Design an enzyme around this catalytic site. Structure first.
Site, short mmCIF file in Angstrom:
data_model
loop_
_atom_site.label_atom_id
_atom_site.label_comp_id
_atom_site.label_asym_id
_atom_site.label_seq_id
_atom_site.Cartn_x
_atom_site.Cartn_y
_atom_site.Cartn_z
N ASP A 39 7.12 15.52 10.51
CA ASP A 39 7.02 15.59 9.06
C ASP A 39 6.90 17.02 8.57
O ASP A 39 6.81 17.23 7.36
CB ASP A 39 5.85 14.74 8.55
CG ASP A 39 4.55 14.97 9.30
OD1 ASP A 39 4.41 15.97 10.05
OD2 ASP A 39 3.64 14.14 9.10
N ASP B 145 2.65 18.94 13.68
CA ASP B 145 2.71 17.97 12.59
C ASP B 145 2.34 18.69 11.29
O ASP B 145 1.66 19.73 11.31
CB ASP B 145 1.73 16.81 12.86
CG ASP B 145 1.85 15.66 11.87
OD1 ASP B 145 2.45 14.62 12.20
OD2 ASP B 145 1.30 15.75 10.74
N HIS C 246 0.43 17.64 8.92
CA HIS C 246 -0.92 17.32 8.50
C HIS C 246 -1.91 17.91 9.49
O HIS C 246 -1.60 18.11 10.67
CB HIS C 246 -1.13 15.81 8.41
CG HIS C 246 -0.28 15.13 7.40
ND1 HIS C 246 0.95 14.58 7.70
CD2 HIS C 246 -0.48 14.88 6.08
CE1 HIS C 246 1.46 14.01 6.63
NE2 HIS C 246 0.61 14.18 5.63
N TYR D 47 8.83 11.17 8.92
CA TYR D 47 9.10 9.96 8.15
C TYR D 47 10.48 9.89 7.50
O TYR D 47 10.85 8.82 7.02
CB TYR D 47 8.03 9.78 7.06
CG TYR D 47 6.66 9.81 7.69
CD1 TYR D 47 6.19 8.72 8.40
CD2 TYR D 47 5.88 10.95 7.64
CE1 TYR D 47 4.96 8.74 9.01
CE2 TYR D 47 4.64 10.99 8.24
CZ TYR D 47 4.19 9.89 8.93
OH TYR D 47 2.97 9.93 9.54
N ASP E 205 0.86 -1.17 0.00
CA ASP E 205 0.00 0.00 0.00
C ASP E 205 0.90 1.22 0.00
O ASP E 205 1.40 1.62 1.06
CB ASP E 205 -0.94 0.02 1.20
CG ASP E 205 -1.86 1.23 1.21
OD1 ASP E 205 -1.79 2.04 0.26
OD2 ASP E 205 -2.65 1.38 2.16
N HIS F 192 -5.26 12.15 13.75
CA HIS F 192 -6.32 11.97 12.77
C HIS F 192 -7.47 11.09 13.26
O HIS F 192 -8.52 11.05 12.61
CB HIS F 192 -5.76 11.36 11.49
CG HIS F 192 -4.74 12.21 10.83
ND1 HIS F 192 -4.95 13.55 10.56
CD2 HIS F 192 -3.47 11.95 10.44
CE1 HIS F 192 -3.86 14.07 10.02
NE2 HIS F 192 -2.95 13.12 9.93
C1 LIG Z 1 0.19 9.69 3.75
N1 LIG Z 1 -1.10 10.25 4.14
C2 LIG Z 1 -1.32 10.09 5.58
C3 LIG Z 1 -0.38 10.95 6.43
C4 LIG Z 1 -0.73 10.86 7.92
C5 LIG Z 1 0.20 11.64 8.86
O1 LIG Z 1 1.38 11.59 8.78
N2 LIG Z 1 -0.40 12.48 9.88
O2 LIG Z 1 0.34 13.22 10.80
C6 LIG Z 1 -2.15 9.58 3.40
C7 LIG Z 1 -2.02 9.80 1.89
C8 LIG Z 1 -3.21 9.23 1.09
O3 LIG Z 1 -3.75 8.24 1.47
N3 LIG Z 1 -3.67 9.86 -0.14
C9 LIG Z 1 -4.80 9.30 -0.89
C10 LIG Z 1 -6.03 9.13 -0.26
C11 LIG Z 1 -7.11 8.60 -0.96
C12 LIG Z 1 -6.96 8.24 -2.30
C13 LIG Z 1 -5.73 8.41 -2.92
C14 LIG Z 1 -4.65 8.94 -2.22
K LIG Z 2 -0.84 20.07 12.30
NA NA Z 3 -7.16 2.10 1.71
ZN LIG Z 4 1.73 14.18 9.70
#
Ligand SMILES: CN(CCCC(=O)NO)CCC(=O)Nc1ccccc1
Ligand SMILES: [K+]
Ligand code: NA
Ligand SMILES: [Zn+2]
Ligand SMILES: [K+]
EC number: 3.5.1.48
Length: 641
Positions: free
Chosen positions: A267, A174, A176, A307, A22, A137
């Site tokens: 990150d 963070d 995100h 990461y 994935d 999240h």
């Molecule tokens: C890496 N991302 C999570 C970061 C969490 C984090 O680090 N939080 O602090 C998720 C990316 C992703 O899934 N993109 C996506 C979603 C749906 C359809 C196609 C593509």
């Molecule tokens: K944040």
């Molecule tokens: Na999924």
């Molecule tokens: Zn993050």
């Protein structure tokens, strides 16, 4: 008073991982914990922290933030094979499950609760939990974005319930958006949530309209949610610090939280493939340091994302270094935030102007592979603070402070050399003593890694300032920031760019050039709030851009010093904490407050209010006058010609 820093870690939380292909989840690996703890051990930081064991969050504790239906579903994942874990994972966005992740999710949450208890019981001053899986999240009935349970929301809900706290600040740095945390406290005025995040006009995951600056909270909680979207990648140290000085810190100090919880995802650091930001690992030393005066220092740092294994380890170390009180590294090359960041900043300040005093003047027209240099070593000083009270006065000193009045032979020769050349007719052996003290303290500060800062009580200001400043400039300290509370002029020349002078006076003075900042605040009940607004919005941005090698603090005896401890703590973000303070005359309380802040002790909260409109006008006039030279002062996009 509490001492020490908790470090909460267990290698059990590295014992779950992704078991199928994935690409959206590959980056969340066990080695993030391994590399971070090992980096802390490598640099001797883990060994100086109090190791507090993890525990499981109980069912009751999980139900503070999550629904029984969601807990019950997650509770069945340990019995699932890989096929069923994959099918269960696909019910959610950007998350994977593993036979052991339910166990590790309870450990990550219990580790957080252990950290809250350690700080709130005064067993430690502050601490950090290195946990997997992350939390921010996670939502009441959903896993999301590598998160199973919402570690940081637990922490605030738990501190509310068990310590009856009324004000909790959550800082999510963070990269995100922590939407699970936002949803949890959307309507709650007792929790102030701040998040900056890569947004790119909602094209960056999790792609939510309510991640924008216009989500301020709901109902009774309006104003206690603060979203700062980053609409371009490559944000720098200056963007992050502009966010702190012009959005987060003004709100944080007005809110006056009783506890601070950091959702600490790295990150947002250079080199990370998710954030694609450009801020150096050293910036987290200052993000931590700038929040440490709040809530008498009660800060719980909780690992979220991050990461790039290298920037991860270095940023974890810079944070713990600051939690431990080690001197902050100097940040060079600071200037204006970029236009995109200034746009985000001005937009959040404007929608938040209805709710926060620091922004209220905005509401009316009358009022207004990647590579980077390895971080240098951060070693604590043997004696952090040396003190020279008047002759005879003995004071009770923190364990990391010392008297220092023993002038050596070389030092005594310099004092008469200086006297014979620049002060012919000076006989007062009290003044000549203070200049022996200044030079001896300054030489210990600069030549040694084992004295960091100091404070000297002096008789005559003019002579003492000259020798302090001149002896610093000849050492040489490339640049000197001078902070002077008092009136009149000092023997300070600001005509070469080696000195910047902040002066807080009583009479309104004309300000001619751009290496002086003069703040005449109205005498009255609102001097405290006006000073704090000036400190966060004017003094710190200029000082950080100036990047001095030494800070020289000066208070005249005639001169509202219940903010002096906050400034002394915050100003130690500059010059790796090397500050010399000259107090004119003996004031017992002012001297012990100065020594305590210089020594890194925690300081009392300010508690309560709003500043004078005349004062805010004066401060914004200073900004307009200085921000073309000192771009870190800007909190609006400038007009293109
Ligand atoms: C890496 N991302 C999570 C970061 C969490 C984090 O680090 N939080 O602090 C998720 C990316 C992703 O899934 N993109 C996506 C979603 C749906 C359809 C196609 C593509
Ligand atoms: K944040
Ligand atoms: Na999924
Ligand atoms: Zn993050
Ligand atoms: K809230």
């Amino acid at each position: 008073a509490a001492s020490g820093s908790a470090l909460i870690f267990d290698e059990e939380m590295s014992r779950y991982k992704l078991l199928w292909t994935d690409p959206e989840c590959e980056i969340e690996v066990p080695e993030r914990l391994t590399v971070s703890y090992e980096a802390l051990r490598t640099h001797g930081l883990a060994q100086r922290c109090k190791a507090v064991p993890v525990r499981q969050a109980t069912e009751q504790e999980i139900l503070l933030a999550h629904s029984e239906e969601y807990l019950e579903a997650v509770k069945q994942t340990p019995g699932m094979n890989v096929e069923e874990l994959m099918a269960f994972s696909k019910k959610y966005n950007a998350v994977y499950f593993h036979q052991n992740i339910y166990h590790c999710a309870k450990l990550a949450a219990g580790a957080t609760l252990q950290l809250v208890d350690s700080v709130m019981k005064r067993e430690v001053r502050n601490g950090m939990a290195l946990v997997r899986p992350p939390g921010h999240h996670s939502q009441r009935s959903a896993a999301n974005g590598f998160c199973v349970f919402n570690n940081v929301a637990f922490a605030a809900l738990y501190a509310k319930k068990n310590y009856n706290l009324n004000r909790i600040l959550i800082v999510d740095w963070d990269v995100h958006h922590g939407q699970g945390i936002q949803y949890c406290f959307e309507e709650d005025p007792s929790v102030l949530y701040f998040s900056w995040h890569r947004y790119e006009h909602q094209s960056f995951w999790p792609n939510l309209p309510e991640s924008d600056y216009s989500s301020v909270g709901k109902g009774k909680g309006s104003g206690f949610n603060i979203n700062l979207p980053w609409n371009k990648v490559g944000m720098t140290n200056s963007d992050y610090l502009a966010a702190f000085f012009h959005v987060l810190l003004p709100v944080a100090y007005e809110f006056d939280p009783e506890l601070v919880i950091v959702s600490a995802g790295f990150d947002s650091a250079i080199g990370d493939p998710e954030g694609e930001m450009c801020a150096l690992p050293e910036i987290f030393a200052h993000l931590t340091h700038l929040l440490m005066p709040l809530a008498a220092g009660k800060m719980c740092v909780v690992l979220e994302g991050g990461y790039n294994l290298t920037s991860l380890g270095q940023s974890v170390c810079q944070t713990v270094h600051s939690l431990l009180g080690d001197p902050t590294p100097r940040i060079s090359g600071l200037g204006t935030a970029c236009d995109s960041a200034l746009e985000s900043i001005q937009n959040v300040r404007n929608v938040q102007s209805s709710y926060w005093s620091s922004f209220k003047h905005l509401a009316q027209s009358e009022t207004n592979d990647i590579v980077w240099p390895e971080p240098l070593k951060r070693m604590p000083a043997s004696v952090r603070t040396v003190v020279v009270p008047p002759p005879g006065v003995e004071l009770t000193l923190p364990k990391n402070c010392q008297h220092s009045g023993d002038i050596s032979e070389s030092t005594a020769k310099e004092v008469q050399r200086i006297r014979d050349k620049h002060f012919h007719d000076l006989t007062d052996q009290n003044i000549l003593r203070s200049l022996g003290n200044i030079i001896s303290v300054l030489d210990r500060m600069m030549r040694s890694d084992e004295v960091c800062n100091g404070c000297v009580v002096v008789s005559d200001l003019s002579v003492s300032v000259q020798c302090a400043l001149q002896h610093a400039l000849t050492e040489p300290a490339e640049r000197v920031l001078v902070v002077y509370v008092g009136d009149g002029e000092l023997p300070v020349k600001t005509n070469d760019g080696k000195v910047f002078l902040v002066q807080i006076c009583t009479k309104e003075t004309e300000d001619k050039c751009v290496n002086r900042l003069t703040l005449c605040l109205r005498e009255g009940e609102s001097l405290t709030a006006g000073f704090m607004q000036a400190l966060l919005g004017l003094i710190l941005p200029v000082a950080y851009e100036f990047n001095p090698a030494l800070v020289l603090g000066i208070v005249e005896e005639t001169a509202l010093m219940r903010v002096w401890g906050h400034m002394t703590c915050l100003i130690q973000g500059l010059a790796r904490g090397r500050m010399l303070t000259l107090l004119q005359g003996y004031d017992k309380d002012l001297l012990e407050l100065t020594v305590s802040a210089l020594s890194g002790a925690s300081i009392s909260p300010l508690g309560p209010r709003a500043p004078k409109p005349e004062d805010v006008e004066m401060m914004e006039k200073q900004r307009q006058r200085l921000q073309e030279r000192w771009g870190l002062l800007r909190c609006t996009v400038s007009e293109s010609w």
